[PDB]
Structure 1
Amino acid sequence: TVGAYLPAVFEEVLDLVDAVILTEKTALHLRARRNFRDFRGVSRRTGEEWLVTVQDTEAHVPDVHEEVLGVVPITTLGPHNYCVILDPVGPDGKNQLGQ
């Protein structure tokens, strides 16, 4: 909630946390602190990692159950460019190791 906030007697203020702004050329690498649910409603187990894109939100504030591992600059290939991906992610969402 936006405005001015009075903490309760039992609550204490720790710090302000501002959103990370997402664009077409950027994504956000997050790790689960514990098991929880995120704003997409998708369930997150301890330790597993994912990316949040600008198709998810334009501004994301890291939850208390999330860890910001870093910002992922996009990889663009031109019509004269290719690449090879090591350990690609498969259909089930796992890295396919050694592939």
Structure 2
Amino acid sequence: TYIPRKEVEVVEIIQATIIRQNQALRLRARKECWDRDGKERVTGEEWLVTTVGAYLPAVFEEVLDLVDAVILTEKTALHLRARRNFRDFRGVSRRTGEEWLVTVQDTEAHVPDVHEEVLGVVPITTLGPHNYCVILDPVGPDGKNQLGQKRVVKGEKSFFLQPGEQLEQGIQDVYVLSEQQGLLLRALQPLEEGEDEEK
């Protein structure tokens, strides 16, 4: 209970919010302050709080909205543009506009940071033993899309189309041929195909 005083005025009666599990709460500053972790916050700076239970705000902190983590099954991934420079939960440095993916091997659940942008959920591309596909603009060893080029993927294999990439004509099926059937086919560029011992 509260006993009043002459020089102290009660402004309002603030009420806590309940952070359930696999959630988080976004709340900005109204003034240059510190948070409960003891980190400086400038005005307007938003951050997340990830403690489960009743969460009572502070006097300058504002509660905007509750955020719920996304569940990542083996057949889905998470496409995330960066909003500015930070380091994520895995601890790699991102830059503004940089896009990447989050998979199950990282986390089973990911709550989208205030420094990230959910662009969409990427379902897995799976190829049977009788299927192949041609990836447009594949991602090279430097992590950057190689524009203009292509890459042919064949076999019992499943993978995610990383951002930038695109399938040319969908999941395609391989040409099986009897001994009564043949293919006529032209070369676009000088090539070498040593299927057997010869070339």
TM-score under structure 1 length normalisation: 0.99
Deviation (angstroms), 1:69: 0.2
Task: Tell me the secondary structure at the aligned position of residue 34 of structure 1.
Answer: coil
Mapped partners of 2:85, 2:78: distance in 1: 19
Q: Structure 2, unaligned stretches of length 5 or more?
A: 1-50, 150-199
Matching residue within 21, 30, 50 for 2:100 = 50
Mapped partners of 1:93, 1:47: distance in 2: 14
Aligned length: 99
Mapped partners of 1:62, 1:33: distance in 2: 12
Structure with the bigger percentage of strand: 2
Mapped partners of 2:137, 2:59: distance in 1: 51
Deviation (angstroms), 1:25: 0.1
After superposition, give the CA deviation of every residue in 1:62-91 in whole Å (9 maximum; x if it has no partner). Answer: 000000000000000000000000000000
Larger Rg, first or second structure (1 or 2): 2
RMSD: 0.3
Structure 1 segments (4+ residues) deviating >3 Å: none
Please state if 1:39 is matched with 2:86.
no
After superposition, give the CA deviation of every residue in 1:29-75 in whole Å (9 maximum; x if it has no partner). Answer: 00101011100001000001000001100000000000000000000
Mapped partners of 1:27, 1:34: distance in 2: 21
Identity of counterpart residues, as a percentage? 100
Mapped partners of 2:74, 2:60: distance in 1: 42
Deviation (angstroms), 1:26: 0.3
Mapped partners of 1:58, 1:26: distance in 2: 11
Mapped partners of 1:26, 1:56: distance in 2: 13
Query: What residue in structure 2 maps to residue 2 of structure 1?
Result: 52
Q: Structure 1, unaligned stretches of length 5 or more?
A: none
After superposition, give the CA deviation of every residue in 1:12-32 in whole Å (9 maximum; x if it has no partner). Answer: 100000000001000000010
Task: Tell me the secondary structure at the aligned position of residue 4 of structure 1.
Answer: strand
